[PDB]
Scaffold this active site. Structure first.
Site, PDB file in Angstrom:
ATOM      1  N   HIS A 127       0.672  -1.350  -0.020  1.00  0.00           N
ATOM      2  CA  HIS A 127       0.063   0.160  -0.070  1.00  0.00           C
ATOM      3  C   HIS A 127       0.930   1.410   0.067  1.00  0.00           C
ATOM      4  CE1 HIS A 127      -3.710  -2.000   0.970  1.00  0.00           C
ATOM      5  NE2 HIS A 127      -2.942  -3.017   1.525  1.00  0.00           N
ATOM      6  N   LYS A 169      -8.967  13.656   4.330  1.00  0.00           N
ATOM      7  CA  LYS A 169      -8.107  12.262   4.411  1.00  0.00           C
ATOM      8  C   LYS A 169      -7.198  12.746   5.687  1.00  0.00           C
ATOM      9  CE  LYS A 169      -6.215  13.336   0.568  1.00  0.00           C
ATOM     10  NZ  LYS A 169      -7.209  12.660  -0.471  1.00  0.00           N
ATOM     11  N   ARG A 170      -6.396  11.485   6.059  1.00  0.00           N
ATOM     12  CA  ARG A 170      -5.476  11.842   7.058  1.00  0.00           C
ATOM     13  C   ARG A 170      -4.352  12.773   6.738  1.00  0.00           C
ATOM     14  NH1 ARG A 170      -5.625   7.587  11.395  1.00  0.00           N
ATOM     15  NH2 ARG A 170      -3.627   8.640  12.023  1.00  0.00           N
ATOM     16  N   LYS A 176       0.718  14.333   1.272  1.00  0.00           N
ATOM     17  CA  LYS A 176      -1.040  14.553   0.754  1.00  0.00           C
ATOM     18  C   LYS A 176      -1.133  16.006   0.500  1.00  0.00           C
ATOM     19  CE  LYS A 176      -3.291  10.966   3.006  1.00  0.00           C
ATOM     20  NZ  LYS A 176      -3.914   9.673   2.382  1.00  0.00           N
ATOM     21  N   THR A 190      -8.824   6.517  -2.387  1.00  0.00           N
ATOM     22  CA  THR A 190      -9.931   5.795  -2.576  1.00  0.00           C
ATOM     23  C   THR A 190     -11.065   7.033  -2.209  1.00  0.00           C
ATOM     24  OG1 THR A 190      -9.946   4.894  -0.380  1.00  0.00           O
ATOM     25  CG2 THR A 190      -9.527   3.432  -2.222  1.00  0.00           C
TER      26      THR A 190
HETATM   27  O1  LIG Z   1      -4.144   3.744   4.810  1.00  0.00           O
HETATM   28  C1  LIG Z   1      -2.788   3.237   4.426  1.00  0.00           C
HETATM   29  N1  LIG Z   1      -2.228   2.812   5.560  1.00  0.00           N
HETATM   30  C2  LIG Z   1      -2.445   2.764   6.825  1.00  0.00           C
HETATM   31  O2  LIG Z   1      -3.474   3.243   7.430  1.00  0.00           O
HETATM   32  C3  LIG Z   1      -1.366   2.421   8.007  1.00  0.00           C
HETATM   33  C4  LIG Z   1      -1.842   1.867   9.121  1.00  0.00           C
HETATM   34  C5  LIG Z   1      -0.776   1.369   9.999  1.00  0.00           C
HETATM   35  C6  LIG Z   1       0.766   1.546   9.664  1.00  0.00           C
HETATM   36  C7  LIG Z   1       1.089   1.925   8.516  1.00  0.00           C
HETATM   37  C8  LIG Z   1       0.161   2.451   7.540  1.00  0.00           C
HETATM   38  N2  LIG Z   1      -2.636   3.119   3.065  1.00  0.00           N
HETATM   39  C9  LIG Z   1      -3.712   3.415   2.169  1.00  0.00           C
HETATM   40  O3  LIG Z   1      -4.236   2.401   1.584  1.00  0.00           O
HETATM   41  C10 LIG Z   1      -5.179   2.675   0.625  1.00  0.00           C
HETATM   42  C11 LIG Z   1      -5.807   1.453   0.037  1.00  0.00           C
HETATM   43  O4  LIG Z   1      -4.828   0.557  -0.369  1.00  0.00           O
HETATM   44  C12 LIG Z   1      -4.287   3.327  -0.632  1.00  0.00           C
HETATM   45  O5  LIG Z   1      -5.467   3.660  -1.659  1.00  0.00           O
HETATM   46  C13 LIG Z   1      -3.588   4.743  -0.085  1.00  0.00           C
HETATM   47  O6  LIG Z   1      -3.137   5.254  -1.388  1.00  0.00           O
HETATM   48  C14 LIG Z   1      -2.667   4.150   1.013  1.00  0.00           C
HETATM   49  O7  LIG Z   1      -1.909   5.526   1.554  1.00  0.00           O
HETATM   50  C1  LIG Z   2     -12.272   6.824   2.153  1.00  0.00           C
HETATM   51  C2  LIG Z   2     -11.568   7.067   3.373  1.00  0.00           C
HETATM   52  C3  LIG Z   2     -10.164   7.275   3.552  1.00  0.00           C
HETATM   53  C4  LIG Z   2      -9.271   7.233   2.307  1.00  0.00           C
HETATM   54  O1  LIG Z   2      -8.983   8.575   1.887  1.00  0.00           O
HETATM   55  P1  LIG Z   2      -7.973   8.844   0.722  1.00  0.00           P
HETATM   56  O2  LIG Z   2      -8.301  10.389   0.198  1.00  0.00           O
HETATM   57  O3  LIG Z   2      -7.569   7.875  -0.187  1.00  0.00           O
HETATM   58  O4  LIG Z   2      -6.475   9.254   1.980  1.00  0.00           O
HETATM   59  C5  LIG Z   2      -9.705   7.822   4.940  1.00  0.00           C
HETATM   60  N1  LIG Z   2     -10.631   7.949   5.821  1.00  0.00           N
HETATM   61  C6  LIG Z   2     -12.003   7.763   5.688  1.00  0.00           C
HETATM   62  C7  LIG Z   2     -12.793   8.045   6.871  1.00  0.00           C
HETATM   63  C8  LIG Z   2     -12.622   7.397   4.647  1.00  0.00           C
HETATM   64  O5  LIG Z   2     -13.984   7.198   4.280  1.00  0.00           O
END
Ligand SMILES: O=C(NC(=O)c1ccccc1)N[C@@H]1O[C@H](CO)[C@@H](O)[C@H](O)[C@H]1O
Ligand SMILES: *Cc1c(COP(=O)(O)O)cnc(C)c1O
Ligand SMILES: O=C(NC(=O)c1ccccc1)N[C@@H]1O[C@H](CO)[C@@H](O)[C@H](O)[C@H]1O
Ligand SMILES: O=C(NC(=O)c1ccccc1)N[C@@H]1O[C@H](CO)[C@@H](O)[C@H](O)[C@H]1O
Ligand SMILES: O=C(NC(=O)c1ccccc1)N[C@@H]1O[C@H](CO)[C@@H](O)[C@H](O)[C@H]1O
Ligand SMILES: *Cc1c(COP(=O)(O)O)cnc(C)c1O
Lengths: 807, 807
Positions: free
Chosen positions: A347, A538-539, A544, A646
């Site tokens: 990921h 998003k986080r 980002k 996503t």
């Molecule tokens: O969210 C994470 N990772 C974490 O939350 C995470 C959790 C614990 C430790 C390290 C990373 N990765 C995310 O996973 C989504 C789904 O494949 C991708 O679309 C996105 O680009 C990626 O940053």
């Molecule tokens: C869809 C979703 C995410 C992922 O968002 P990205 O813009 O791909 O980082 C994170 N948090 C919540 C609550 C979501 O619904």
């Protein structure tokens, strides 16, 4: 009222009586003392009853048919609420709506009482949740396996513009959706030592912790299939007296809280325990179920284990341990079996996130696993040396063991060596894995690498959160699209339809008014629903680039102050997201955002032309509210850093236009809707590389762009922090001397592109026509498509849209 | 089948369908995978459903009628199992018996699956449980308030003859009888400091812990009344990040485990916290309910608080704190109110058990309470000085504050000063309180002291555990006696009835065969059901003198070995009970008992004439099994040490003859049945005093009784501990030099009396006739009588046997 199912007279009557039954016998209340919370529980129990029959037959069916089983292992499952989703997949929404109405209640009000099951950080956790829904909808015999944290992702509170973390006690009032199954508790071992005796190794003197499972139903969309998500809870074995029982909590701390670390890999022992805990209990369950269905030759034909990132990577050495140590299979045979049943999903490519466990930790906690890992490494490297004779450097690069300060185990290398398939989550991301990070492995076994572009579930992310939009679409093309999103393409033939254009534009305005209201109701702020809703949720991460968004916002504000009486498209820009507790920079950015709003939102000259709002406690249930109300979706990560994303797909499906870089899935989204219907800008992956060869010097951009220089000087002089003039020195310092994400390099192109967005927004008709072309081409991004590909290209099972023999 | 209620055709049909409903919707199972445990749960839920209606109306009734409310505060509630008890009080036993039969199940087998709610140590906790049952049966608006420990009294395991403590995880599979009520969580404060400002004192900077209540229904006997037992659970407020949430367990440890200390007062901080916790949450609940029903003048007319021992004694200073600090009542008015609503029950005169809290502990944890206690003391001592001018020594003896090594607060003195009533639990015990321990207080306020002889509930302790005996009794005198035990007297006119004598003797033989079987089934041992069942079951204490019993057993064994071919009445002597974890002597006695059995039970010359069995894990559910099967009940504490005892009353009601000293309730029992029908022996309270004035010298008895000397030499030489010859030196040492309980002084009279018991047992007809006279005169010892006296003489409420308006 909508295609939320039929509201049958008998059905509505039955629902009402069962609601009263539960209120009385289950909640032990009466209409005179019941609170809204009690009403929610009475409804949840009534709905939950409809799942039982299907749940039992589904599991029974799998027992008789004995299909290949898919096990999705993840340390995160970002589920959100389940009441409405259950009504939707069961076609009970309208019936319950009617029934509660007649009981004199507002269903929407009751739904707001349910807590979010926040057992995830963001994207990765939410993907597991969407995947579970799609697997059920496609009739796959799938099981989601994870940990039942009593505390999910922390609740975010903003204090004085700063983030404050608060425990998310989601089980406080109980969880009506889970079913404790103590009859299936399994033992998990830790520590101990290895004994090498005549016939094999033996792991002895281990500390035992019990894993008690909790099952949650996962209903498919109107097909009567109900799969299971099994979450393990840590329990101490019952075998100073007071101190001894008080110390039980040390063993049970394993499943106590979700690690909120999003960006940096810490390497804490408690986390390694959580990882082995879910892996050890899950595998026993898997093998037990297999033994029922001893030649493990057929193991891979009956079992598929998908590893969501490297978190559950210990499954590889643990499968070997069980097979070799307990079942007494020869190594080679055991390895063949392991590789054929395991598959790994990556990921991210950023180094700081990679799991590299100190050898001394594995040595103490899991001595036998370390021995197996060393053996796996030995044999693997022997394969490499035979393929590339004399390439001594390749040997050190590919090793699962990293030398240096402290020896560590590279879990990603472990996953590649022990899996028959490795996949990225978006075309560009998967290509980058082959070209860079895993180049050596790709050269050794090219056949292992694949791509499986991410997707989202159309049930939760369209039908559930945007019934209005779902209705007008169904009015023209039917309902078949809800489980076959590609049918959305048929909407292209309405791009010139005066009626449709008016309707699409109407639901978006209703969604914005609804959100604008909620913002005042639960947060009292007031925004102009006529402005453009500019949102980035998003986080919070440097990659980002919420900071790039901030620069633009300050630029807009500066331009207004310069020419106050010039017209500009009004905008409400909303930024929301949680920062990992230890991520200082991320917490400093949240502060900046709120500090900008304090200046901008109270400047009389600006009026209602510009509003900067920070969305508190962004989570799944909040996303279901903001996304359907957004006009502009911000997906501006530095090219090559966002594996997929996503949230971007969620905005596309809900009528928002996207402004972003050619990163992750953005690339495939623009490719599907046509670049003319997307607001693309900034450097591409290649431009970033070129800049890197050259050397990124932020000063250059600071020197050539007056507008940019002015912003940086405002930050440095305390313009946005009067009482604390140097509050943001860290951000300015980073931007100027150590910006790994080249914020400045994309500033000019971003601002210009944002001007083109404002121009289009000024033309309602054309803005909406472009929206229709985005919605009409979002079909590819349904997780049903993603899962169908995993099923066919990795797991070896055929998806089926066949309804199960009634309930 | 018995008078366990009628088994109606419609009733049985309805029960069966609801059993299947729960098995499916509640347990989520099907007849093909259900385990006996699932069956038990399906039944428990079906039965529990019948309580809901009554529970709601009962509480509703109390709301409308607004009667005076009785609050029984105890840190212990030894409930045992509740399935059968619920069926009995609801007259559902036969109907459920029939229904499960038709479903193809054995109800008795399912009942054995339920776990004991062991939230108590012994007598004191079980009295609270019997009291709750009687209060409901007498229609009093009563509430039992305590702590919901997740771990009750430890499960006792015997390893190599030694006691091993094991956590009692009773909630592992869930508790279907409780109902969590998070909507009523209340805050409890600890630590902090006191601020004296203009208008009153203020307790500030306190640490907060939340009290979440769990309600359990308490059904009266066939009167449709269902009262509530509210148990508080400790919860941390949600306001390193990981460490912070992991540290929540420190606050929640308050309700984690029941303190198993039976004999010595330790004075641990965790226990003081538990005590304030239950008191603080309960009082808020009480006042809130009162405010609904602000002139607190009527508080005592609407509220009665009974303190079960000094454990909940902080209720006195806490009521004052609330009334004075928060409600702003003047001290004197607040004190008047407090005294009029509080009443205290004492359960022992032994000094080591008295609660005397170090002032430094109260100072740190509850600073404001310490200030109130000092003020209460000041005013009280001013009253004493005015009543006995110049009696400077009386002043120091009566003070609530004890000087010396470390200052302590005498909680018993606190309770006397702040209560309008103080009672002992048996006539002799209450007299001793006035004559000795509380002499000074009795002289100051003679009107405060009362007696309320203990009792047991005839439902659980007769109808439930001995249906056979209950049936034959009902066959002659009807059923009215179950809630009016005095009617048992009518059985005197059958003492010469050849039929009755045969029946009474028959049920006892069936009970013994049943127990003898269970002993082999679950413990594999085998005993002769034709021998006399000699049993002593209760917690292990030196004052209870299990050691005296041991001496007799060894004497019998020694006499047999001397004259092997002489006839003796065969005996199976069973001793059972748990020892407090830190009570060394008590654990040494358990070892002695098992060591005696190892010699005796394997001596070929003894044959089946003598068997020594230690009953493992004695608890409420086990008592329900042994007691109905006993012939001889051992109640041999040193005169003046057992406040009352209740196991003695349980044996009397079930057809066993009693051999005991004139101690506690034994005195009133012999007085009721006639000394000729009791096997009394040993010193009376006066003889013990005389011996004390003189000086107890064990050597004297050792020198004059050869049989005794031989026993002591066997212990010293290692006769009962071959491998460890000096294993029992501590016991012998204690017996000879520091026996506070004069075991030797009663040895001769005890052995002779035991000979008279054996002689009577040889005459079946006369033994049974004597039994009939005991059972026929046990009516006085029903807790219904006890509660009626508390109601009338202390609480000021009239009991009512009026059925509540149907369900
Ligand atoms: O969210 C994470 N990772 C974490 O939350 C995470 C959790 C614990 C430790 C390290 C990373 N990765 C995310 O996973 C989504 C789904 O494949 C991708 O679309 C996105 O680009 C990626 O940053
Ligand atoms: C869809 C979703 C995410 C992922 O968002 P990205 O813009 O791909 O980082 C994170 N948090 C919540 C609550 C979501 O619904
Ligand atoms: O927790 C659940 N959950 C479900 O029944 C359920 C049913 C369908 C779908 C999801 C959960 N049930 C619970 O199971 C325990 C133990 O059997 C019972 O004591 C309790 O009353 C019941 O609600
Ligand atoms: O725990 C109980 N207990 C009782 O219902 C009950 C009823 C009568 C007598 C004793 C307990 N009920 C439980 O209450 C929770 C929260 O409302 C529900 O989610 C759960 O399904 C239900 O079994
Ligand atoms: O059981 C106890 N005490 C305890 O269990 C106890 C618990 C904690 C701390 C100190 C004592 N006392 C017992 O209470 C019963 C009921 O009144 C009496 O009949 C009996 O004589 C007495 O010893
Ligand atoms: C009745 C009872 C007690 C009290 O017994 P005494 O002989 O009065 O000490 C203790 N434990 C249990 C399990 C009981 O049922």
């Amino acid at each position: 009222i909508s295609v939320r199912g039929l509201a049958g007279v008998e059905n509505v009557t039955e629902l009402k009586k069962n609601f009263n039954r539960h209120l009385h016998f289950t909640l032990v209340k009466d209409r005179n003392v019941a609170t809204p919370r009690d009403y929610y529980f009475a409804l949840a129990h009534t709905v939950r009853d409809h799942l039982v029959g299907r749940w039992i037959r589904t599991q029974q069916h799998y027992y008789e048919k004995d299909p290949k089983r898919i096990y999705y292992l993840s340390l995160e499952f970002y589920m959100g609420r389940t009441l409405q989703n259950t009504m939707v997949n069961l076609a009970l929404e309208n019936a319950c709506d009617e029934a509660t109405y007649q009981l004199g209640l507002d269903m929407e009000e009751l739904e707001e009482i349910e807590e979010d099951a926040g057992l995830g950080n963001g994207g990765l956790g939410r993907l597991a949740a969407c995947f579970l829904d799609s697997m059920a909808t496609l009739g796959l015999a799938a099981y989601g396996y994870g940990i039942r944290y009593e505390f999910g992702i922390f609740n975010q509170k903003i204090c004085g513009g700063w983030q404050m973390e608060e425990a998310d006690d989601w089980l406080r009032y109980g969880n009506p959706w889970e079913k404790a199954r103590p009859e299936f508790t399994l033992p998990v071992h830790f520590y101990g030592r290895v004994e090498h005796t005549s016939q094999g190794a033996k792991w002895v003197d281990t500390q035992v912790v019990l894993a008690m499972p909790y099952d949650t139903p996962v209903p498919g969309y109107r097909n009567n299939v109900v799969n299971t998500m099994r979450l393990w809870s840590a329990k101490a074995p019952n075998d100073g007296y007071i101190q001894a029982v008080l110390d039980r909590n040390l063993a049970e701390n394993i499943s106590r809280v979700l690690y909120p670390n999003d960006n940096f890999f810490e390497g804490k022992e408690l986390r390694l325990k959580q990882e082995y805990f879910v892996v050890a209990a899950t595998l026993q369950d898997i093998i037990r179920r297999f033994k029922s269905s001893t030649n493990f030759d057929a193991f891979p034909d009956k079992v598929a284990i998908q590893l969501n990132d490297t978190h559950p990577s210990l499954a590889i050495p643990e499968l070997m341990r069980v097979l070799v140590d307990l079942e007494r299979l020869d190594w080679d045979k055991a390895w063949e079996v392991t590789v054929k049943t395991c598959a790994y999903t990556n990921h991210t490519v950023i180094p700081e996130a990679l799991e590299r466990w100190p050898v001394h930790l594995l040595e103490t906690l899991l001595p036998r696993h370390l021995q197996i890992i060393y053996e796996i490494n030995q044999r693997f490297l022997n394969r490499v040396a035979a393929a590339f004779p004399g390439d001594v450097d390749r040997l050190r690069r590919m090793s699962l063991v990293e030398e240096g300060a402290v020896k560590r185990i590279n879990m990603a290398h472990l996953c590649i060596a022990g899996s028959h398939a490795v996949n990225g989550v978006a075309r560009i991301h998967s290509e980058i894995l082959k070209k860079t990070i895993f180049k050596d492995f790709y050269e050794l076994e090219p056949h292992k690498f694949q791509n499986k572009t991410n997707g989202i579930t159309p049930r939760r992310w369209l039908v559930l959160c945007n019934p209005g939009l779902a209705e007008i679409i169904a009015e023209r093309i039917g309902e078949e699209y809800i489980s076959d999103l590609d049918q959305l393409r048929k909407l292209l033939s309405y791009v010139d339809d005066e009626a449709f254009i008016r309707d699409v534009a109407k639901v978006k305005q209703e969604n914005k008014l609804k959100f604008a209201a909620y913002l005042e109701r639960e947060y009292k702020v007031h925004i102009n629903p006529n402005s453009l809703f500019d949102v980035q949720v998003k986080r919070i991460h440097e990659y980002k680039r919420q900071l790039l968004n901030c620069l633009h916002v300050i630029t807009l504000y500066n331009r207004i102050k310069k020419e106050p009486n010039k017209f500009v498209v009004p905008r409400t820009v909303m930024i929301g997201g949680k920062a990992a507790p230890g991520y200082h920079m991320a917490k400093m950015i949240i502060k900046l955002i709120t500090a900008i709003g304090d200046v901008v939102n109270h400047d009389p000259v600006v009026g209602d032309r510009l509003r900067v709002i920070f969305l508190e406690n962004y989570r799944v249930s909040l996303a279901e509210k903001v996304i359907p109300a957004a006009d502009l979706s911000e997906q501006i990560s530095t090219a090559g850093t966002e594996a997929s994303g996503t949230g971007n797909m969620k905005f596309m499906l809900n009528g928002a236009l996207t402004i972003g870089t050619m990163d992750g899935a953005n690339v495939e989204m623009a490719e599907e809707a046509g670049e003319e219907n997307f607001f693309i800008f900034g450097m591409r992956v290649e431009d970033v590389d070129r800049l890197d060869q050259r050397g990124y010097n932020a000063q250059e951009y600071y020197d050539r762009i007056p507008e940019l220089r002015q912003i940086i000087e405002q930050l440095s002089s305390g313009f946005f922090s009067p009482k604390q003039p140097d509050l943001f020195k860290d951000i300015v310092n980073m931007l100027m001397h150590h910006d790994r994400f080249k914020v400045f390099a994309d500033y000019e192109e971003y601002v210009k592109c944002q001007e083109r967005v404002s121009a289009l927004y000024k033309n309602p008709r054309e803005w909406t026509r472009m929206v229709i072309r985005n919605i009409a081409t979002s079909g590819k991004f349904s997780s049903d498509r993603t899962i169908a590909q995993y099923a066919r290209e990795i797991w070896g099972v055929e998806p089926s849209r066949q309804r199960l023999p009634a309930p």
